[PDB]
């Protein structure tokens, strides 16, 4: 692991290719400018609550505009079949790589505001809260289940299992055992913060796309 | 309480180890390689040459794979020298229960290491060759 | 017969709601086949360089030379993620007709057994 | 005595392997022990017979494609998971120069 | 590492003592602060002893708290019929929940009942404040083993022999007289 | 040390590409 | 060989109450039905039918609607023993049991008669 | 607690959490460190550390409503450490406020907190706090054949360290040099030579760094 | 291994699935190990069979053994099966009535809530005991008192990295009964867990007094006989196509070793002999006994694992009498066996010989409470080895009392299974014992037969080992002849 992380950091260094451009279109001013966006002050969970309820809504509204009442997206954000499908059925609901990454991410989110919860509601701890946002972070791979829908993930599943090995060795050396109270999330943290980054403008095409064949129609004419 | 075991399963261990380490390699050195790697204690070089002459003799035909691999381990360290004389006097003296097969197949492995030099050529001061003094075998 | 309460003033059940519910329908930490290795290395390694006691110490732990197989712990903390299957992969045509083009290489169940399906039951029980 | 040979030899048994996992659906290593693909067939094993799991030698590019200099170093063949020495098809073959011999001297006696 | 609980955490317990046995209630009370000071504080004033358990509905609900025993009496601390109090975790879908009896809406008076089963359709009508503890649920359950001449009244209902209150949650209680 | 020898990278070879030094050496 | 003596003795294992034991015995049957040796295939379906003869249509353990589907495939066999017992055991079947099955079961088993014929 | 800035929908449809987390650099080491100086006084000091489990909830219990359950609730105490008064005098007041000075228009540059300046007993103080976390060497000669350039020349050549990292090589007849019977040889020439030296123990060298430091 | 027609373009073509089928069925329990990780299980459709992972080929091998429901009707097989075996015990285990719940279909197989089975509500009342395994001995049956009891019955479907069935009898009887939606009529019942791919079972919950054995046999009985289990087991042997070459089904019937040498470890004691003597006649003409050493006798059937323990004369210095001494010596000896055996290897069950000795054993057992105690109704000649000179010697000239150990299945566990070595090594023992001369004659066949040094017996092919086995058992039944007057071709 130790020579992994050279490897990156190595690669890092010499790929910088320079900012070699530029334009700084500005998001949430132009939201915030009209007439539509208010704004207040809230508490970082009372956001999170409200951000995983309103990517449920959005995911149901697109299924049942889709007609699809034989599936169900339940609130762990895993799309399920209620009975057995005909086939005109299971040609009907496939969906695409766009939805089930929207999906995915909306699970490891949810995942992040409910061990935040359990910390709120008094059930855990705060060396608890640590240790188990370290694991989320150390373990998306079996949380969640995105490297269907993009296998390139398995880079990150790989950075972050490479960090844990260098922490643990680094923090489990003398009277501490081989237990599981270890909370460092920072390193995790920032290499997901990293992913998102970069799948952002992806999944804004992608589900503008899905969008606009939703509400316009699929063009034919001049393929 | 200090249960005194007498089944004699360290060497049965130890023999059915050597022999799938000889029988998974592919040349004396690979073969050599894996021996030296593994560790033991050095109540078992006795053991180590003598198992290795079994092994060899128990084959069909000869090759000189097990000839050279004993060969190595004697090159390396004198201890394999001792048991290997050793070895010649007391098989010699106890051939006669060998089948002609295994009993050819000591012949030519003795003859392997004398030529190469493995074993001093003053081990043959066992063969009084009377007529008496001698069995068949 | 009247079941006694206990008069008591906590309340009842696991405190912290089960926040921290362990996983088991394995065996007990101490006795898997991992715990085994752990124990069986640690006497390989203080009888490492030492001549044999004849002494007798289990079979997992006869002096090994050549320094994995078995079962394997699982987080007891994960809670696995169940879903229904509920396409049974049944030839139609042969259920319907008793014959398949396909013959041997039909990748699906060859059965005619027509029966209620899992969610049938629960379907008629529950407008029942 | 063909190096290249053994190389061919550890790339094609992991080929064949690899294609009965592509075959179920999953190449998880696991999953697939050894014990699955070289058990007998008498047991219900697949019966595979192996040289892929040796140590092929190495030594120094530079002075190997000169004069022979020997083997210093032994890269690993296939991966077994713990120790499990795989037994060689070779070792139960028999050379020919001690075929050429014994078939001589059986004959002779066999005169 | 399978199963979850589904509900918040109680605070304060009250012990009922009837003819079939005790009742142990744990009180919602912060979820539900009016009906549980109510509650309390009509069981520290003994206002609920020698009361009968007067409907019983098979599966459904058994009834009780009203002193006169006809079925519509009762009447809260707060002279007048108070409110109702949700929530989202609290939600009538298993046995042992104690819940506001009443007519209508605003209309949570003295009376209150227990569940025996799943009552999906109460949700939002009822203020749910307590639940039975483990090892009393079958004594609760034993208050519906009868014979029911109709108007859903028992032939002999039981009765609270006596409260108890085993941890009281609020401090400023202090009871009429 | 990579002195000559191991893949250039274990990518295609059918193994994890481990190089020990031959311990037989002598 | 087996299979043989079960339907010679298909008569006293019944008439001596043999629920356990006679259950065992149709179904133990019922699932060797696949069995790809004619000359085993055949023994199989004559205890099948000597069960059927003596304990009736309307209580063998594998219904009678479990039975007849299962047979109809049987019916292409074209090897002789099998194809003996076969159209032996529907025979029964159509005379006596014939409303545990649909009629287009029967018009399939129809169209599969007719190439028996040969 | 921390409470965000937010932009919101006027229907409900979405809500963005809308500021950067800027922080200040040895102030946020500095809590990093003491984060890790407590962390394992408590892994080494409780008898049994129960690890929570995931998910939280249910599949089937709608997330949760801040108003009915989280609202009132008091917050549980966290993972801050005890700093003494005597040697953590320069600390004490606002170590762990969520952004350390954010009003104090001597320390910052002001409300949108860029620009930090702090006096030297704070950086000391920092600097102690910071000290698990931080490498104790002084200087270069640690990564001799370990920086950068190094790593640039062992890519370029293929060619790996004992300890370094390995990559695909960058591009994939006779010669009477190469005699046998001509050379000397006394010691045998390692990677770590025609690294250190790429221009005088190597032939084809493309795009190699030249490493050398003596500092 | 399992020693025309007009067909259509497919049927020249594609691949034939049965043996890609018939290979995934065998190799299943490694194919579809738990804990090889994603998270996601899925479970099938109308079973308990969860499938970690996506494998088709998997699927429609498990999926066409549980076909037309076999997995509810399993469940409701067995649970008649257990209604009827207290419909018998009615009175004897003073149960008043025995009811059984009208199963919701999907009982079988919903696998995070459950309802019960069986009801039995009692005539007068019940002390129940605290929660424990079944194969767990000791109870006190004082915790609390109950009027209904109630029965659940679980199926699960192990694998290789999880088959242990007393935790997830534990597990289960735990999580279902502190579960807030659960449904059960009582506080008080127990939990039966049967595991259909390894055929074993167990139980957790509250026993009254009786209820114990009576299940213990009834479920030991059920997984034997019952009906639906033998529909299974066959349904699994014609999808792997696997045909046994044995007939006669050998001697494995409901006596136990077929069982015994089952996972569950278990020991076989034979202490007969920890007091000998013999005689030597003096110029008195007064026929003078010495005692000597004897020796407790201790194997594990299943490694074929001997320990012997020496008992030296000199504990017979001057404790007053003999016999009921050497049984409490035995009994301590035992547990100090068992106290420097490491973990795994110590037993579940012992099995005595003279079963006035599981007396003193119980009492020096109770460090051990859970290690149930048997008389053998097997009765082993282990103290013919005795005649063996190996043993015999050792023992004869011990000066310590010391501890040793031997292997009585020198080899023949490479090429036979732990079953057919203990057959071969109870008719050698009887042989011995029987008549240990023509015993020794035919143990010896060739001139060139020999033993080798770490060896108990000959070293002889497995030709010889049949003919041998042969003819010592019809030296036992010559001598069964002989001394009971018997012709023995008519048994
Ligand atoms: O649970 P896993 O995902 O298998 O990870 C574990 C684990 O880490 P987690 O705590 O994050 O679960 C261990 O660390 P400890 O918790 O036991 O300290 C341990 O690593 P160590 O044994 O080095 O502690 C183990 O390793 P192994 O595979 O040797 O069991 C493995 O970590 P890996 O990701 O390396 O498997
Ligand atoms: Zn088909």
Known sequence: SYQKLLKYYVLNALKHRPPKAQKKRYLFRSFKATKFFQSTKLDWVEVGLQVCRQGYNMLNLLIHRKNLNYLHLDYNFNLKPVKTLTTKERKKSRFGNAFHLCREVLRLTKLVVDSHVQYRLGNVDAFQLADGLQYIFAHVGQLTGMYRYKYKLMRQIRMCKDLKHLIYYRFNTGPVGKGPGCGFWAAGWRVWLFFMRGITPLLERWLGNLLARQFEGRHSKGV | VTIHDKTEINLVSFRRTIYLAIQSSLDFEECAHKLLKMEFPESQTKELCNMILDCCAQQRTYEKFFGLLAGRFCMLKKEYMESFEGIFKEQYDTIHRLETNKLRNVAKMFAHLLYTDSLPWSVLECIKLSEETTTSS | VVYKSTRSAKPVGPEDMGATAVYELDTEKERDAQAIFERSQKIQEELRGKEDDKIYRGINNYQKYMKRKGPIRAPEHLRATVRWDYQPDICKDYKETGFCGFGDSCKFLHDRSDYKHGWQIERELDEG | NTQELLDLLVKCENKIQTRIKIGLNSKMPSRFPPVVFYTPKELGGLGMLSMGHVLIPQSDLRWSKQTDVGITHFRSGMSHEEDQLIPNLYRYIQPWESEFIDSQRVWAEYA | SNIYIQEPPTNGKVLLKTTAGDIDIELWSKEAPKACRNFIQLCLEAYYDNTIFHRVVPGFIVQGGDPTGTGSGGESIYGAPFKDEFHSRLRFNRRGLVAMANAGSHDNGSQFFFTLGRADELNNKHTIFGKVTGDTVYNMLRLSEVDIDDDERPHNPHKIKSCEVLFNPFDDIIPRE | MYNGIGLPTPRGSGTNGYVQRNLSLV | ?118 | IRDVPVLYHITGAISFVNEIPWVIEPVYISQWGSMWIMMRREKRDRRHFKRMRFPPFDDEEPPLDYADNILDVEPLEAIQLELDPEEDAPVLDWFYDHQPLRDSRKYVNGSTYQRWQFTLPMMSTLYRLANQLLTDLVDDNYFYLFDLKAFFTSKALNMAIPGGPKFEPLVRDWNEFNDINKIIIRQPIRTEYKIAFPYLYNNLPHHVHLTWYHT | WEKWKKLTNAQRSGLNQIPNRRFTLWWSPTINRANVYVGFQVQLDLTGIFMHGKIPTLKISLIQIFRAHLWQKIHESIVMDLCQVFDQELDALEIETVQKETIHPRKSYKMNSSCADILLFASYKWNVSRPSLLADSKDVMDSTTTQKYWIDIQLRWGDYDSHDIERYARAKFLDYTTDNMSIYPSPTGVLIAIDLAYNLHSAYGNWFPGSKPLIQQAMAKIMKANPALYVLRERIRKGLQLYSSEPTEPYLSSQNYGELFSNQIIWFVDDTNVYRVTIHKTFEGNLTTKPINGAIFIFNPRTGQLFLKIIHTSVWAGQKRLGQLAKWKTAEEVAALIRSLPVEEQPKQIIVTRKGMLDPLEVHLLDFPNIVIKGSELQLPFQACLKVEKFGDLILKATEPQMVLFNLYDDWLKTISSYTAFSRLILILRALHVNNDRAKVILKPDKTTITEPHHIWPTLTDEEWIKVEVQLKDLILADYGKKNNVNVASL
């Open chain 7, 1 to 118: 060989q087996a299979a043989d003596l079960i339907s010679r003795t298909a008569v006293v294992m019944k008439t001596c109450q043999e629920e356990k034991l006679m259950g065992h015995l149709g179904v133990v049957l019922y699932e060797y039905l696949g069995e790809e040796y004619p000359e085993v295939l055949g023994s199989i379906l004559g205890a099948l039918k000597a069960i059927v003869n003596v304990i009736g249509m309307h209580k063998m353990t594998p219904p009678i609607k479990d039975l007849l589907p299962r047979l109809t495939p049987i019916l292409k066999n074209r090897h002789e023993k099998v194809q003996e017992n076969c159209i032996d055991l529907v025979g029964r079947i159509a005379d006596r049991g014939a409303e545990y099955v649909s009629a287009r079961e029967w018009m399939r088993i129809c169209f599969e008669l007719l190439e028996l014929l040969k």
